[PDB]
Amino acid sequence: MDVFLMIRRHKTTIFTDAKESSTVFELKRIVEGILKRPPDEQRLYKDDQLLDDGKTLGECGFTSQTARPQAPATVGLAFRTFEALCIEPFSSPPELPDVMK
Amino acid sequence: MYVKLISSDGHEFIVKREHALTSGTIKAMLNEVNFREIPSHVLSKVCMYFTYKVRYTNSSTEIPEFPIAPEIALELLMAANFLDC
Amino acid sequence: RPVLRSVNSREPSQVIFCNRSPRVVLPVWLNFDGEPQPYPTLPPGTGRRIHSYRGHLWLFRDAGTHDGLLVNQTELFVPSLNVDGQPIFANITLPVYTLKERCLQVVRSLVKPENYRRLDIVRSLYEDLEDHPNVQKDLERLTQER
Amino acid sequence: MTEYKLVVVGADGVGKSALTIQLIQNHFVDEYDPTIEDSYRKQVVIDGETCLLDILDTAGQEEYSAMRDQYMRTGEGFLCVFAINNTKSFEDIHHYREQIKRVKDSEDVPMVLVGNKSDLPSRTVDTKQAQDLARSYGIPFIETSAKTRQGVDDAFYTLVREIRKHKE
Ligand SMILES: CC(C)[C@@H](C(=O)N1C[C@H](O)C[C@H]1C(=O)NCc1ccc2cnn(C)c2c1)n1nnc2c1CC[C@H](CCCN1CCCN(c3nccc(-c4noc([C@@]5(C)CCCc6sc(N)c(C#N)c65)n4)n3)[C@@H](C)C1)C2
Ligand SMILES: Nc1nc2c(ncn2[C@@H]2O[C@H](COP(=O)(O)OP(=O)(O)O)[C@@H](O)[C@H]2O)c(=O)[nH]1
Ligand SMILES: [Mg+2]
């Protein structure tokens, strides 16, 4: 029922949750309340797939098995022409010490 | 209400205020909190624990194991020790 | 003397132990003197109809690491009398560990105790890694929290 | 020369001592002291194998000490005896099996359910009830009479075979 996501654009990541039955447009309204941009100026992606406003999150591929609180699914976000999706990568951990194999 | 957490490398993580209060160190400081001691890949993992805690505390369903990759274990331990969570 | 102990009721009570955790559960019974007494373990996802008594105290730990576990959302399980012979259910799950304690568990499972102090961490954490889960110590904390 | 450690349990007066003495000494004791607990050894040929049977005829009041727990822990097989003319002895069987499971740290312990005094007409426990109890436990149920020697060798030899299947 509940899918847990992290919406990412540039160096911004939004941890939020939504209902599997809720639509992509309803998720853009959630982003609107945070980033102060209306849904008409937002483009949401799952990997490299542009999400249609009318489809539910479950129909896009977000399920309880793939969008867990401890492992949220990544949703790309683009703002308006529309900009190309850009997600700045996180930092990298150091090499694993030999004491940890 | 939401809280914004800044990593040491300038990543911005927006989480629900209730989720951020899971940390004792963030609770003491409290809209925006800057951490020069936590990188982005660690602070992102920390936020996953926040939603994990709030979701599964007093849960009537079974609780899954919180996963921790060996490569992030040592840094995550230091973060959690600093954040008191 | 110890407050956390079983009551010598001698009144049987049918209980179902159900391991809804990914760990091997070690059921621990606090006898009439407050001492922990281990009982046969439960592999993950396994149930077991056990024979207990009213007023007896139970806690559950990870059989290999003694990591703490929860029963019916709390630390202790005390079965009362069965109502019309229906069994009293004991749902054994993981707790929501603190992130620091979960990290300690994962580092403890990866590094050998001799090489604990070879890690690139703070000296304070070297002591936290060596302070393995302890049933007797958790009983003192639960006795004081009472 | 293989050895099998057998323990005969059940309520007082069900015939534990009479069943044991009938197996080793081949006679029926009408009044054996309910207090004397002893172990008996006998060389027997069971399915062609010569075995030493070490039979513990338990007696006395309950004692849930570590020392009594460990003594019973050494038994490889258990004869759980009740008397067909005593319902309470049948009702106690569940408790005796539960204590066997505890000390053996297992739920798959070689044991046999024994309904003794089958020569008596005053039946109070039905054979179907005992068959159903044995089925739920997954153990054989044998009707015995230490007085007529009915099923006596069968009860003890079957427990030995349950140990052998368990030892493989
Ligand atoms: C003292 C504890 C045993 C304890 C207890 O049971 N707990 C504590 C936790 O609640 C769980 C529960 C428990 O372990 N469940 C069993 C179990 C099994 C598997 C699993 C797996 N997971 N889990 C969680 C498990 C739990 N406990 N606490 N309160 C009491 C008890 C014990 C019973 C007390 C009331 C008994 C009253 N009787 C008086 C009348 C006659 N009766 C009698 N008369 C004479 C002798 C015996 C007798 N019985 O057995 C034996 C033998 C010889 C055979 C056989 C092996 C052993 S070993 C040993 N020492 C023996 C002896 N003497 C025996 N002979 N019986 C019996 C029928 C009733 C009330
Ligand atoms: N009719 C009959 N009586 C029996 C049988 N076995 C034992 N008894 C009687 O039951 C009484 C108690 O038996 P006992 O050997 O002392 O059983 P225990 O207390 O369990 O060891 C004795 O007086 C026996 O004569 C049997 O198979 N048939
Ligand atoms: Mg006797």
Numbering used by the authors:
A (entry chain A): 1 to 80, 84 to 104
B (entry chain B): 17 to 46, 58 to 112
C (entry chain C): 60 to 205
D (entry chain D): 1 to 168
Give verbatim excerpts from the published study on this entry.
KRAS cycles between an inactive guanosine diphosphate (GDP)-loaded and active guanosine triphosphate (GTP)-loaded state, acting as a molecular switch for downstream signal transduction. Proteolysis targeting chimeras (PROTACs) are heterobifunctional modalities, which recruit an E3 ligase to a protein of interest, resulting in subsequent ubiquitination and degradation of the target protein via the ubiquitin-proteasome system. Here, we address this gap through the development of heterobifunctional VHL-based PROTACs capable of engaging and degrading KRAS­(on), thus addressing a wider range of KRAS mutations.
Separation of 4 into all four of its diastereoisomers was carried out by supercritical fluid chromatography (SFC) to give PROTACs 5a, 5b, 5c, and ACBI4, which were profiled in both HiBiT-KRASG12D and HiBiT-KRASG12R cell lines. SPR data also confirmed ACBI4 to induce the most stable ternary complex of the two more active diastereoisomers, for both GCP- and GDP-loaded KRAS (KRASG12D-GCP + VCB: t 1/2 = 3,283 s, K d = 0.9 nM; KRASG12R-GCP + VCB: t 1/2 = 1,863 s, K d = 1.6 nM; KRASG12D-GDP + VCB: t 1/2 = 11,699 s, K d = 0.08 nM), with >35-fold improvement over the initial hit 3 for KRAS­(on)G12D and ∼20-fold for KRAS­(on)G12R. We crystallized ternary complexes of VCB-PROTAC-KRASG12D-GDP and -KRASG12R-GCP with ACBI4 and solved the cocrystal structures of both at resolutions of 2.19 Å and 2.85 Å, respectively. We observed that the overall binding mode remained the same as previous PROTAC analogues for both KRASG12D-GDP and KRASG12R-GCP bound structures. At these resolutions, the stereoconfiguration of the isopropyl group could not be unequivocally assigned from the map density. Based on extensive knowledge of the stereochemical preference of the alkylic side chain at that same α-carbon in high-affinity VHL ligands , and our ternary structures of compounds 1, 3, and ACBI3, the α-carbonyl stereocenter bearing the isopropyl group has been assigned as the (S)-configuration in our refined structure.
